[PDB]
Symmetry: D2
Subunit: 408 residues, 4 copies
Amino acid sequence: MSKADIIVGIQWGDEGKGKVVDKLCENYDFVCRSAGGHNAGHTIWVNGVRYALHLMPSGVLHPRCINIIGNGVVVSPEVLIAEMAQFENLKGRLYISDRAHLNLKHHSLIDIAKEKLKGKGIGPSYADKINRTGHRVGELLEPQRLCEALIKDFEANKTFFEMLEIEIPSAEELLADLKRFNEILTPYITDTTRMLWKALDEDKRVLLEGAQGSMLDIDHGTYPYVTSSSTISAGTLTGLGLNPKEAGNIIGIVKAYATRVGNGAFPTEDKGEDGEKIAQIGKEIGVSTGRKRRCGWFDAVAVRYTARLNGLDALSLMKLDVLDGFEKIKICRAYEYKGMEIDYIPSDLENVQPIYEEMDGWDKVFGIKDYDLLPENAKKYIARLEELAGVKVKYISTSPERDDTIIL
Amino acid sequence: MSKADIIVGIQWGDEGKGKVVDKLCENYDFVCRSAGGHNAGHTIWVNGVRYALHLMPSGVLHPRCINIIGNGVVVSPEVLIAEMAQFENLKGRLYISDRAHLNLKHHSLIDIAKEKLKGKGIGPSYADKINRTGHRVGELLEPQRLCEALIKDFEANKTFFEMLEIEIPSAEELLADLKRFNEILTPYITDTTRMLWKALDEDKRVLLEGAQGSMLDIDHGTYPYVTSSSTISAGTLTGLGLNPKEAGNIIGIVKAYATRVGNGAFPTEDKGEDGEKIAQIGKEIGVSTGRKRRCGWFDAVAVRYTARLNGLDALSLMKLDVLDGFEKIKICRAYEYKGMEIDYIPSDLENVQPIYEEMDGWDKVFGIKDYDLLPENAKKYIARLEELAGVKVKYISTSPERDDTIIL
Amino acid sequence: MSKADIIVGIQWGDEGKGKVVDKLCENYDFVCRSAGGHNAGHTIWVNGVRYALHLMPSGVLHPRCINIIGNGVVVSPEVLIAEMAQFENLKGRLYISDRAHLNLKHHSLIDIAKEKLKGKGIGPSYADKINRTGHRVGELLEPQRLCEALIKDFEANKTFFEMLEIEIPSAEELLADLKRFNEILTPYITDTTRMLWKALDEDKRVLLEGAQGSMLDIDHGTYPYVTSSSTISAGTLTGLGLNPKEAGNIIGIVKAYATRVGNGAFPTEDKGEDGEKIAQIGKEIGVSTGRKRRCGWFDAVAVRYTARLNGLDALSLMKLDVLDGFEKIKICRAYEYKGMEIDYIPSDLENVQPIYEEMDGWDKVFGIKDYDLLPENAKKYIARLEELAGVKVKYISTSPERDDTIIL
Amino acid sequence: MSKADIIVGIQWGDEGKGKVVDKLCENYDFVCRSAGGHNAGHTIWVNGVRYALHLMPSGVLHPRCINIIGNGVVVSPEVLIAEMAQFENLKGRLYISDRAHLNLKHHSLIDIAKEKLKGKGIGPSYADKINRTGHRVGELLEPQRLCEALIKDFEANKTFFEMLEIEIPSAEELLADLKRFNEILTPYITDTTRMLWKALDEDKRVLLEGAQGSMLDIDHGTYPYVTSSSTISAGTLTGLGLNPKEAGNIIGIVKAYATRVGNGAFPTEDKGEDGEKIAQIGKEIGVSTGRKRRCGWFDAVAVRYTARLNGLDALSLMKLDVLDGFEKIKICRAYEYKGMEIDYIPSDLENVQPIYEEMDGWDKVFGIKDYDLLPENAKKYIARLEELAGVKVKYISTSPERDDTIIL
Ligand SMILES: [Cl-]
Ligand SMILES: [Cl-]
Ligand SMILES: [Cl-]
Ligand SMILES: [Cl-]
């Protein structure tokens, strides 16, 4: 069986995949996205230019790569077309599953009204997927048919629209948008299951880019604050129509400390000066809001958990430099839970307290390209993570520069 | 003195300028925007394609036109660059005032945090204009200088940023965005006052597109629900550096009934079935929210007021067909205010009640291209508006089709 | 019967249509090209930008216009795609006849080899049209089928390829180009006869742009130096599938003097200083070679001939200023042919000698916008042309500026 | 001293660099072009799309790469802008030497007239370089100044223009083109010597792409049929302002047989069926003319010569499969010259006759990825080339597929 490698962020997201996935792409013929909406992915700076890949697989920055958006992705044609515009010609380089669900204008309108009543459109688009009332990319090949079906849907749903105080979308406008999507996307729409199976049959090199944090997995992450989809490696197989025998090497991507964007259990969070420092140095700041992210110490219990959920062959450790010059650093080696010490991630994480090992910091790992040259305390910290995680660290990034990486 | 014609919406906006301004552009060498941010303008459908002109003057759809964004406009480079992308080449067709104020990323972030604490960035950008702490388009010609100045500004303001819980913007990111704006916008940035004066000196044909509803004028509109800027015709002169002797023909654009998007005094609002019908037939629905706009009967007191504020030579009456098949239609000829009948717009409009004339409806004006062929009741309604407004109606639009228009 | 207006150059080309057609377009819903390859049309400068319309109708500079490339045109997909790239979005604005003949790469290769043996590809593409072995635009909707058919054609023709010493085109390359043409052109390809008939049925305004000089007409022009196609007005009807009852107003475009680009009979040619002056002032210089065109005095015999061939309602007289400051100007009022004076264009034009009237020049018509203000000698010259041509002059252009035009 | 690697074609061109350079680029930070005009480079197919890099370095297909067009290149702004259009955004990825010579419209016109009198514009642009009358890229930063200087040049040269029968270029047109070049190219124009020196100082990875066949070198190639510039490795250093100490690894690219496009000495040419077969299988066919290239057996004397001229560390052997199924293959191991056997390339190559070794062919090397799996006769042929060339073969390409390559 010819196999696909897999790469996933094993935290709450922002593990810094981009530097990693981007370097790796050169070695693959196919780069594939599996699940999630456009809440996934990342932005990446290349030679001073900002690239958004929320929908598109990272391989689109490597013209040799063929990039597949799989059955599992929830695709907004608007967001996709806007991302495509960052490139001159993607034909032959980008294929979109005819089975991927559409997140259309009306999903955004529904989403907005719902927030009032208390990545737009993703939730309602997923809902329509699960209720099997939504429509899929292949239907864009028949805009007039799709438009008529949608109009029928809205009618049948009119009380839902009234309850949200939004009018039934215009048929004229809808047809015009659908025709536009048809004209633009037709050359990219294909059966991606057939194509990906063919690639593996021909022994081509295939990378699956898991697009979201393992701790955000709908089943295994810290529920309710999680995404709507499976984020772990077997989920990546599923969204692409691949089977467990087709899983190759699997690399987890992990920061040397932890962050969360929103609310939800965060055992190792540091609300004092250490955390604040991490936030500044690590630049963990929402691009859209300018808000500082929540920051905390490396959580080895959470990481061991997601390592096992993903079946990691290797860890790629990021932003180690962000800890330069800390006198002491913490690792959470276990939890205090309901009066006991536990080694695992319980379903109610809000009830655990971190149990820390303290370790001696270092002056600088920043920029270092050679393992031996690392501050001895940094070597100890790395070895301690590896040990607690249960997975070898094969990659260390000592700075934002693509060039500064240590290989083990 | 060689003169510039002017066109303004004389209601609360959405008067339907686009059909009007677009037809007129063919006859002008220069089309100019004066004030406001990107909350102004409109979108227009051409041969099935949706065009956003919020920032850009409508003349950009007529390659013969030179389009000026004046000193008075508050320009977001991001929004402007995105609008420009709808066109292949605007060089020589589009010029941006080096004196126009910049609405940058940080204004959006400020704007968002401010909403929490209770067209992004427009308010804070205007505030920086009035406090004379903001920066202007010409400064983009020196990105490094502008970047340094902005960094200094943020530092001096750091407590304001702390109070909003948003971090000081990255210097690296800022320089990169400013350099990008510089590289892209350099060919369009010029002294627009010198250029427009030259055009009039050479007896070129000039149209000023007022971009916002007269009833939304900051001074004369229904305060607090108004925009931040002057919307009436003399304001249009001011934003472009033009003097009262340079005002030509001035056309007001008015719907055959009235709408408001948000809250605020609306004397002629109809919250019953008539209003609902108007909303549906007139398609008065927020493009972004799908929410029905507030609708009401033509207000002749408000229209006489804005006609005089603008110094209208002529009215262009829009969406007359939206009243097809009403048995009876209303016109508000006066108000009941503090126990009296009044003929004017008082500063506190929330205290007036409409005094209506009722008039007999008609079956169809829809599609009619000849004045004589109009239902006699429609002729009476038109004559009655003209009389109450104090301005001749020179244009009647009987449907969305560019072709269906009556000239008087 | 609802009708299409027509505009044609009535000389040997370069009559200066662009200023004329461009001004007129604003008044039409449809602008149509009829016959010829990409040897037709012109380039036009707008606000300092150079636009090539060889294939595309001039109406593409007026987003309100719908532009039709008719059955009669010989379309090179490469040249067409390159012209389209001057615009951001033409969808809904540009339609290409599914019956138009394709001028493909191999026609260019054939064309080149044929020149050796003694607008590339046009001749061989026309030949394939007349022999009914060529393929048409609609076939691009099935690239694989078209590719297979072409391969079969080449095989059957292999001795022709051997005789030209060019190899049989690659099937792989051909499929790739055809697929590309398919992906790009699909949204523009339609039945243009049905569409144009519908437009006239709906009483839409239609302009047919004749793309080549009447004296270059294959039947009526100076043979052998002529184009391969009919250039006169009834030919314009034919290429679009229109009937004689559908012909509206017909405007001929004529320069105040005459030019020819290549060899061939040119009765009024002036090979001395007068001609040289005309060439310089009129800027009659090949854009691609920098070669001076042949120039000569107005030929009233040729113009009366093409006026009658076209059925002109009106003349539009161009570049009158180019004669400013001539002490004397000539008009050829008749010919000396085989010992007689003749009033007509004989089939062998190389055998005629011009018979001139001499007339008094003027100082300047340049820039003049008012008929009355014209130098009296210029009025006399204009009246004399009109008289000899048999058609009223309704348009006079006194300079390159769009604004400088006199209407009669 | 930090060093730049170099890659050159060591034949008459078409050695098949693209597959090679493209694979290598992923490993470099900078990819640089040194000399030549747009007669150099190649086209490359990526995932079914045709890319022209005549001017641009091959690294532009790898967004991580920074691409430098060096002092030595003769740059046509038109050709460069057209090549750039194949990409959406090159800012930060492409820099053009402010010292590179300009090949402008008038050079093309001169070039055309000169052919009459018996990659347009290249020759006359080079001539202007050598006579020190030409202008360079940096001058585009002052279009008005450059335009004035050029006008002065043309005047001083007017008899040259008269002798060529082409008019003095329009000042208006020239300014408009120069302004356009200025607006478009400003963000890419820099001092490339300073930039490249900085890169090496910072120990960045640098590849120099030699753009033309070593046997076409102006000094060392088969004169008069050669290009105008130095094509060998030290020439590549010179065009970029690099010194001999900065030369790294140098890879020669060589086909398993030989081709020439035009006339000129070609010792190993085969004008019979063997050569014809090579031409068909190797697809050696002019893309623009469809003409079969001249083909011949591998010339070991020529290859040893260019290996030494370039200082090759390694050979990369291409199109070995094109010889599949030949019963016998030839290698030219020496020449008969003026009655003697010689081992070197004499200045008059038209006077040598090939002295062949004959060797046993093989069935298929096509597609083979493993050295050991090669037909034993193929191993012998490879070993024999290496031996005669004096350079190890480190790369073997067994087919067009990027994937089919053997590494030694
Ligand atoms: Cl691209
Ligand atoms: Cl455009
Ligand atoms: Cl456009
Ligand atoms: Cl790109």
